[PDB]
Design a protein around this nucleic acid. Structure first.
Lengths: 110, 56, 142, 150, 117, 103, 48
RNA sequence: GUAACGGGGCUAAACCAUGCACCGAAGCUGCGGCAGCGACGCUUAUGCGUUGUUGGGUAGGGGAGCGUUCUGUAAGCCUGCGAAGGUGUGCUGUGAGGCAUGCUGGAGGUAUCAGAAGUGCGAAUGCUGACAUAAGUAACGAUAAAGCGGGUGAAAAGCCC
RNA sequence: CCCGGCGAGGGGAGUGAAAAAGAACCUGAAACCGUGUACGUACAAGCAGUGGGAGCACGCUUAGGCGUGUGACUGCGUACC
């Protein structure tokens, strides 16, 4: 029985999440969680709260038991980017694009 | 330099694919605790061959 | 109506052994080249490479014939040193003998992809030192 | 387009567009190059031509048998429900009413009726006349339309 | 009359880009390149209406040649022999006996060889 | 026995029980096709014959579909001249099914 | 109703050129004015 | 860098002299479709049958048709008893186009026929937005750098002590 | 009601005709990046298309030479404005 946790509008570039996210993809929940506690990267704490919320809602609510739970998907999508002008030398007025992420976790027993 | 044309999306994928994050070759848990591990390092509670590390 | 066409699986191929000691370079070369495509036999298809698996038994004793010999110097520029570099046909037959006949059929096959696909069916080895007793080679005279 | 003749300009021949004007129609939005002008398409109208299309449709109105031509059709009052009850007696629906006398007790009627309109016969409107189911008419109106067509 | 402009092109676009299903990179997702690709496409297809036929006709000669050469006549002598022998319309796509069941073909070749001068 | 006959300005080989396509006929689905213009029959061995439309031959058949094909596209185009034009065509056909070719 | 059944005399309606619509259209680019010179350009210069 | 037969190869597989063959273009021709119009036959107000030279085409003319916005019949009539819009496919026409239909959608729509026009973008080193691109490349602001113990805290090489 | 930075975001339970109307909420393309599936890529080569095509999944192939999508290989082949 399946549960979605999302974190939308998250403070990450998405290429740096996907490095970590694809690692624990198809891993089963408990091995995935062990691997994640000792990854220091900003991406790994961002994912932690959303991985736990998924697992935690499986341990309750519409879910029942977690021993046969596995993390079928961990993926990341374009969130709304905010545009800002960075001040710089010889009157250069370039764009810095502040990325956010749409993080989707799915766990199921299925 | 500069460039000739806007490049294909298959090119972007090849250049970052080998630079992608590499496997841990599974993980460890302790011989000596109900603590989980980090392999050939010492945990936050100091368990590996005891003593103590990270008194934070 | 439509035409019939070949499929990769129907090809017979078979192994043909050419004694080359009675032959001379270009009459061996262009017949071998004809057979290395399969243009002696019926192809009836634009896109499958048929051919034989072709042994030249020897070709160490292949004449080029006549006065072309003493000005036949196999031109190349692989990448170094002022000048062309060269080798006479005689050095090329007396030492490592395969190559006179090898770069004689090379230019008889088309461009890139089809020309690599036609070539890999041939072997010459050094000459008169063949290992091809067990297949029962079908003899062919040129 | 008002409120500036400015040229954004700063030459042409600098790896970009002419940047031409701050009032140019092409400047994203606010005014376009061929936007509509006032139209008044009315003419002289040639009288022998006008009256000769009206003869063509006036014959057809008889060939399609739509002209009832009621003798002195009128109502007591300009009340819609009375005029409408008159037309029900006459077993007529969705009709062009022609008044022959522009009498105010018929002219101020019929307003409540969905598909009824009332006009006077003097220069009878030919675009109205091909529409509607029937033409109710008076004989005094048939007289003054033939003299306008004479 | 404010007219929208582009609700007619949305269909011309979707016709091009559907024809431009199967194509590489920008060609299946940008009208501009799709449009280019589609136009070269029909130049090659209209070429190949005539050209496909000329191109197979070579294989037609070439399978008849190899039967004939095995039957001790050269192809150009067989066709001029076959011409000198009486009437027959024939056709180059006829000789399935060129590639396979090659026991046959011998009678046409004997007839032609006889008639040759 | 496999056989050849003439469909129009083009010649067509066919077998027994073989369904074949050719340029459109007047003849319909519910009607009879028969071909006296047979150029040879390839018999038990190769035939040595001179004169085609062999009299001691027929292919009898029947129509199995009369339709019109797929749409091909025709492009006439010239760069630098701003010259682009198009035509479509589908081409008609008839399917015949051959039961014939006599022993 | 008889409304809406009227039509021009045979051949009476010339319709006129719109220009500039489509590129496989024959009419399009240039305007029926050809390459370069004053009469291809926008309306100006010489007096009658 | 052969690279002055197009290349391989050829001392006859050359060249010359004489002659024969073949292949080889939307050409030349047959098949099936079609454009406009002459000749002729039925025989006309309009047309239809047979035949036919003809139909590569810019600049450029000339005739027609289509959709997009809009008007009139449409004060009527279809519609949650499923309207507009979105999208994939089949079917279909010379093309523009048209029609069928699963998914979608929760109210609007409509011929016939003629007519008005802010009437189809793909280019203007054109204007705006959403958003790609080189790229996870380059950047760490005079290197007045920093350490280690405890702590606000889930978290500290930059904070507080 | 669950995870959490005293946070962000989403799911669980309940509202509604409808949340496949959940509050940046109308239905929703195209660029854009990512997920998911089939098939392909280590005799490998230039407008990336065309002409021929093994193979393979799916449609009970209506098994009656078929549809769909892809495709090793390989003749031909120089963009538009």
């Amino acid at each position: 029985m399946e549960t979605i946790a999302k974190h939308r509008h998250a403070r990450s570039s998405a290429q740096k999440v996907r490095l970590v996210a694809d690692l624990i993809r198809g891993k089963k929940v408990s091995q995935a969680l062990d691997i994640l506690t000792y990854t220091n990267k900003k991406a790994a704490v961002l994912v932690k709260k959303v991985l736990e919320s998924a697992i935690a809602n499986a341990e309750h609510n519409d879910g029942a038991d977690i021993d046969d739970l596995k993390v079928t998907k961990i993926f990341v999508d374009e969130g709304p980017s905010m545009k800002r002008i960075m001040p710089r030398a010889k009157g250069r007025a370039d764009r810095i694009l502040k990325r956010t992420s749409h993080i989707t976790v799915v766990v199921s027993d299925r | 330099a500069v460039q000739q044309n806007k490049p294909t999306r298959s090119k972007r994928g090849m250049r970052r694919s080998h630079d992608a994050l590499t496997a841990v070759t599974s993980l460890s848990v302790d011989k000596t605790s109900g603590e989980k591990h980090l392999r050939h390092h010492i945990t936050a509670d100091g368990y590996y061959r005891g003593r103590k590390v990270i008194a934070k | 109506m439509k035409t019939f066409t070949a499929k990769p699986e129907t090809v017979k191929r078979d192994w043909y052994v050419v004694d080359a000691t009675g032959k001379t370079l270009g009459r061996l070369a262009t017949e071998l080249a004809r057979r290395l495509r399969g243009k002696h036999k019926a192809e009836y298809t634009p896109h499958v490479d048929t051919g034989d698996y072709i042994i030249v038994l020897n070709a160490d004793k292949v004449a080029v014939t006549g006065n072309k010999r003493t000005d036949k110097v196999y031109y190349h520029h692989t990448g170094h040193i002022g000048g062309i570099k060269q080798a006479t046909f005689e050095e090329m037959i007396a030492r490592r003998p395969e190559r006179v006949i090898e770069i004689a059929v090379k230019g008889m096959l088309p461009k890139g992809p089809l020309g690599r696909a036609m070539f890999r069916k041939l072997k010459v080895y050094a000459g008169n030192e063949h290992n091809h007793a067990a297949q029962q080679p079908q003899v062919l005279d040129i | 387009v008002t409120g500036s003749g400015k040229k954004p300009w700063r030459q042409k021949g600098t790896g970009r567009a002419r940047s031409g004007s701050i009032k140019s129609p092409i400047w994203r939005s606010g005014g376009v190059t061929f936007a509509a002008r006032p139209q008044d398409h009315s003419q002289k109208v040639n009288k022998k031509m006008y009256r000769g299309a009206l003869k063509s449709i006036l014959s057809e109105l008889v060939r399609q048998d739509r002209l009832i031509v009621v003798e002195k059709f009128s109502v007591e009052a300009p009340k819609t429900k009375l005029l409408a009850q008159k037309l029900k007696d006459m077993a007529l629906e969705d009709v062009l009413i022609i008044t022959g006398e522009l009498d105010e007790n018929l002219f101020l009627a019929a307003r409540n009726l969905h598909k009824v309109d009332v006009r006077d016969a003097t220069g009878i409107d030919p675009v109205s006349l091909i529409a509607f189911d029937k033409v109710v008419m008076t004989a005094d109106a048939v007289k003054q339309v033939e003299e306008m067509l004479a | 009359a404010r007219v929208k402009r582009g609700v007619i092109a949305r269909a011309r676009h979707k016709k091009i880009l559907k024809q431009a299903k199967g194509y590489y990179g920008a060609r299946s997702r940008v009208y501009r390149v799709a449009f280019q690709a589609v136009i070269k496409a029909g130049q090659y297809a209209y070429r190949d209406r005539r050209q496909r036929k000329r191109q197979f006709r070579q294989l037609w000669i070439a399978r008849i040649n190899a039967a004939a050469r095995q039957n001790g006549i050269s192809y150009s002598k067989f066709i001029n022999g076959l011409k000198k022998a009486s009437v027959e319309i024939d056709r180059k796509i006829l000789a399935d006996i060129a590639v396979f069941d090659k026991v046959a073909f011998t009678a046409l070749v004997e007839k032609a060889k006889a008639a040759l001068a | 026995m496999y056989a050849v006959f003439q469909s129009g300005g083009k010649q067509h080989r066919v077998s027994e029980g073989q369904t074949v396509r050719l340029e459109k006929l007047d003849i319909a689905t519910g009607e009879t096709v028969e071909f006296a213009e047979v150029l040879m029959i390839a018999n038990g061995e190769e035939v040595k014959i001179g004169v085609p439309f062999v009299d001691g031959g027929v292919i009898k058949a029947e129509v199995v579909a009369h339709g019109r094909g797929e749409k091909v596209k025709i492009v006439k185009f010239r760069r630098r001249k701003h010259y682009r034009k198009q035509q479509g065509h589908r081409q008609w056909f008839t399917d015949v099914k051959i039961t014939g070719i006599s022993a | 109703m008889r409304l809406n059944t009227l039509s021009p005399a045979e051949g009476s309606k010339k319709a006129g050129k719109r220009l500039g619509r489509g590129i496989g259209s024959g009419l399009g680019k240039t305007g029926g004015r050809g390459h370069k010179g004053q009469k291809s350009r926008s309306g100006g210069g010489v007096r009658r």
